[PDB]
Design a protein around this ligand. Structure first.
Ligand SMILES: Nc1ncnc2c1ncn2[C@@H]1O[C@H](COP(=O)(O)OP(=O)(O)NP(=O)(O)O)[C@@H](O)[C@H]1O
Ligand SMILES: Nc1ncnc2c1ncn2[C@@H]1O[C@H](COP(=O)(O)OP(=O)(O)NP(=O)(O)O)[C@@H](O)[C@H]1O
Ligand SMILES: [Mn+2]
Ligand SMILES: [Mn+2]
Ligand SMILES: [Mn+2]
Ligand SMILES: [Mn+2]
Lengths: 601, 594
């Protein structure tokens, strides 16, 4: 027993762009010589396994060679690269000296040499004048390479054309090409019959077919359609058993590529699809498709009305409307602009979606999702204070929203119950991004903004601030939700700011606040932004890890399976019962502003 | 109730020299005291307070004039130096205010409306400063201080190594501490948790080498130097005194605040460099591990460590051009050097004179698996399961990068000294596309997949065919398809695995896997389906197998080879010396990567 020798033919660097530039020589032959070669090939144990198409390129490519009476065609020890077929004559083959075979015409020999550069095991020498056919290894692999690649890519442009097959990689689709079966039918043969159960899919590669169908059990079948090279039928079968709804009869000599479901199934994001569609709907809306039907809120910078589509009254939206003269007077152009940019680009279940903006010469219009469950501040007003477990639910929704915004480098900067709205399920979402800003990581911004009771001390002190300011506000929010009032507040803003600067540890916490809640509040309202929980290595995950949030069903909240603490009554998309009544803005409309600074609204 | 949000005007360029109004020391001390008396502004830091003091400007008002009228919008904060004013609201007199008191400071946060009227009772001298100039001070000094701080850090080796967003949090926790002349910042022998960076001044570092003698001068450290590193990794015992030589400020950080904010396998960046300065003559040949169609594989040893042995495959350059196999040797080098898998022999580097190519690889002294199979006859089911598992891992690595191996057989499986099997010989390996096919007839006859024989095109699924052959040979001592010559062997292969009567030696699960690996149609072979090679690891035969222990090298191999030394070639057959005439030279240039 001795080690086995590896062998190799010449490598290949041959692709689809080379099919047109290789050359397969053609030598004309009598039909009788072509069937002699065809029979000889089909008699060889190895070559009879090639495809009849490829066999009949080989016969066309073999060339004539004649030897006299006592000539030697193969020398033992020589290297071989040719396979031969004898036409006329007879030849005797000898090894080291023994007379081995004697073989006459119509037999293939030397065929190992079309696999690789063999050493010949015997010498074959003529006896009578012989006519041979030959093809050498290089041209045989060129046939195999060219025909195989042609057939393969032909198959894959057939599959790429089927809708059931459009959706899948180039890979995988090439295993599918290798699982096709070619089936040929003669004229009048039924490929498929109405009412038959089927598991096979058909693609017509050659010929044409007639699609007949009896509308009745006992009408005779009526003509319907004709399908040709490129058409398919039976696609229903690749998802399950298909009841064929028509006969398909071969109108001529037909070849189809056939695939059944089991071989298919052995080889087992709608993002720019789903959300691109919503974008189109909102894009071809004008301001003139809405009616104002009620008022959801009144703010410092704009009124928020409930609006209804004139053409689909199921579809209502919240519309924030801002006076342009007012935005210019308060010098808030870039704050409104970032409200638009950040809210439009945010895709968070805990942030109200901004679908688009409109504009006329007096107002800017922000069209967002309506949340008819109610403003959290009015709910806190009506109830006084929220239980520990109720506050935990709403605080968690803010925390999820902050996890999304802060991960994209965005500071929110106006947390407060007036800016938390309940949807119809009772889930809280952030509105009002008028102070939100996309800042760097590790960079700081300097605008003094917020709502006094909620402003972080580093904003008051003009020291620079970042997303950690939001965690300070989160602590204020918890304290207010749990007791009904925020911890820092005075009769005028300057007094309110001065109390904030004295810090959270100078406040006597009411006994209402559970120990874990008080602990989290104090860890969120540290004076130094670098000491605040949420601004450390693990970011917001440290807040979700606190004792107070231990036990909380974070993933039930994220998956929307968590039952909210307060279920709002919303009877219809028009139901504003969960909101206060507001009087009409009966003031004179502001001056027009066609300066152009709002070109991007 | 219900609260309204407020906002100042939003707003980098260094081009803004601040205005300066000269002031008496008395007037500058009057302004500073007033600021430090105001509940809000007393919380700003003193550096900024003296920029504000230097930047506010003088204003004079006459008798009976209003400095502020209720209802106006404010943007100025004031401090009076001389005079008296009356504060009124809706005509009611609230108070009288004298010099040295800040008022109107709400207006430096945002445009507040004034809540009261301030009217002079006499001539009045005030200082005032605008919001849109207070913001500029706070921003400028704030950004200047910040970028200065982080340029102090990053110069520290203990820092530098971590993202910038982190070090800007680190800058925000450094505490400025000032020391006067002769003050000891730190003393030798003290236990400390603080790290220091000198921002102003310089210090003398003294140290007594004895308790008996006296602290000698050692060093002088100045603006930019640091000390007390070691304290940010744990308690540091100070190795010297640091005394302030002048008025000194240092930025100080203790370990607990450091750790509260914080919380790179450059070893092949290293070991790759080492292999680069080697010449093809720093080695000795010790013996020969094998002889192949291309060339001998010799064990070679580095002259300088003798601990370090390697396998070196040597190929006759024109033997390769004779066989027209240049582009296969190119892919052997490319793929084996680029492969990083514990189940594939590493190719560290290439050499070449112009007559030979030299492939320097990891030596595996456990022995050729074919020689072990030769000596033992056949492997147990569990023994074969181990070696097949290493091949499967190797194929998982190669096939996941689009590379077909194409010469699996026991002659190409080598055991290392632990007994773990690895693939050698990548002469037929090729990086082909995904879903693409290649056409070169190559392999070893008993192992060649039928789609290679028939020239139908092949891809990595051919390796799964060979894997089934391997299992069959390991389990029985001979492969399933074999005849007295090639062509007979190839014709038997074409008749398929189901025409072979399996010996009863082969367990049912193994036979099932072999037959599932050697399907004629490559799209039917286990490993070529949706889950890829993971389907093979899922088979009944591999159920119970410790795949994760194998990958971690904790699984005990079925055969532990005796290797006494890195020079021990006992586990290999002996081969005679390469005594034929040297081949001709080849400077064609196809060996560009020598
Ligand atoms: N999308 C919405 N769905 C339901 N109610 C909403 C929505 N957006 C706003 N509101 C209500 O309208 C009020 C004013 O909206 P907001 O967007 O907060 O205006 P503003 O002028 O920015 N207020 P502020 O900036 O805090 O002074 C909110 O406080 C909510 O009560
Ligand atoms: N890294 C190695 N460590 C130890 N022994 C090795 C190593 N690589 C190869 N060998 C041995 O040397 C023999 C020849 O090496 P190989 O790399 O297989 O040469 P080849 O010319 O490609 N043989 P083949 O093409 O199959 O005829 C192998 O079969 C092993 O027995
Ligand atoms: Mn608001
Ligand atoms: Mn707002
Ligand atoms: Mn080998
Ligand atoms: Mn090899």
């Amino acid at each position: 027993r001795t080690k086995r020798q590896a062998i190799s033919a010449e490598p290949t660097a041959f692709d689809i762009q080379d099919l047109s530039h290789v050359t397969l020589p053609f030598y004309p032959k009598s039909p009788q010589s072509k069937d002699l070669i065809k029979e000889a090939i089909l008699d060889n144990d190895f070559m009879k396994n090639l495809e009849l198409s490829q066999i009949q390129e080989i016969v066309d490519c073999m060339y004539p060679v004649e030897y006299g009476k006592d000539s030697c065609i193969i020398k033992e020890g020589d290297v071989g690269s040719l396979v031969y077929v004898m036409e006329d004559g007879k030849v005797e083959v000898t090894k080291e000296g023994v007379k081995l075979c004697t073989m006459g015409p119509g037999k293939v020999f030397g065929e190992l040499a079309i696999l690789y550069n063999c050493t010949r095991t015997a010498t074959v020498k003529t006896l009578v004048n012989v006519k041979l056919w030959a093809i050498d290894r290089q041209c045989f692999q060129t046939i195999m390479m060219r025909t195989g690649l042609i057939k393969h890519t032909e198959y894959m442009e057939f599959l790429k054309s089927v809708p059931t097959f459009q959706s899948l990689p180039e890979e995988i689709l090439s295993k599918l090409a290798d699982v096709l079966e070619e089936t040929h039918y003669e004229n009048g043969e039924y490929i498929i019959r109405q009412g038959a159960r089927g598991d096979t899919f058909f693609i017509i590669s050659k010929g044409t077919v007639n699609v007949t169908r009896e509308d009745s059990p006992s009408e005779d079948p009526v003509f319907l359609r004709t399908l040709g090279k490129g058409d398919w039928f039976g696609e229903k079968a690749l998802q399950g058993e298909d009841v064929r709804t028509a006969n398909v009869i071969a109108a001529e000599a037909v070849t189809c590529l056939v695939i059944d479901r089991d071989s298919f199934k052995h080889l087992i994001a709608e993002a720019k699809a789903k959300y691109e569609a919503e974008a189109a709907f909102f894009a071809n809306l004008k301001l003139s498709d809405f009616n104002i039907i009620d008022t959801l809120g009144v703010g410092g910078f704009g009124r928020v009305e409930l609006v209804q589509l004139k053409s689909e009254e199921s579809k209502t939206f919240a519309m924030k409307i801002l006076k342009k003269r007012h935005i210019v007077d308060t010098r808030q152009q870039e704050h409104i602009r970032s409200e638009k940019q950040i809210m439009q680009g945010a895709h968070s279940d805990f942030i109200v979606r901004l679908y688009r903006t409109f504009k006329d010469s007096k107002y800017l219009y922000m069209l967002m999702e309506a949340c008819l469950g109610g403003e959290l501040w009015t709910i806190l007003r009506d109830r006084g204070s929220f239980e520990d477990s109720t506050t935990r639910f709403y605080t968690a929704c803010v925390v999820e929203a902050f996890a999304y915004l802060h991960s994209k480098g965005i500071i929110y900067r106006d947390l407060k119950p007036e800016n938390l709205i309940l949807d119809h399920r009772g889930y809280a979402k952030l509105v009002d991004f008028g102070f939100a800003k996309k800042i760097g990581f590790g960079k700081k911004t300097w605008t003094f903004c917020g709502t006094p009771e909620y402003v972080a001390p580093e904003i008051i002190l003009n020291k620079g601030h970042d997303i950690s300011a939001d965690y300070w506000s989160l602590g204020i929010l918890m304290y207010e939700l749990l007791t009904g009032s925020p911890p820092f507040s005075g009769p005028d803003p300057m007094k309110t700011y001065n109390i904030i600067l004295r810090g959270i540890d100078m406040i006597e916490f009411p006994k209402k606040i559970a120990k874990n809640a008080a602990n989290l509040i104090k860890k969120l309202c540290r004076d130094n932004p670098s000491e605040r929980l949420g601004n450390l290595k693990n970011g917001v995950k440290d807040i979700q890890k606190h004792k107070w949030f231990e036990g909380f069903n974070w993933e039930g909240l994220r998956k929307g399976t968590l039952t909210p603490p307060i279920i709002p009554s919303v009877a219809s998309p028009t139901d504003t019962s969960n909101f206060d009544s507001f009087p009409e803005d009966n003031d004179e409309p502001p001056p027009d502003d066609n300066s152009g600074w709002d070109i991007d609204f």
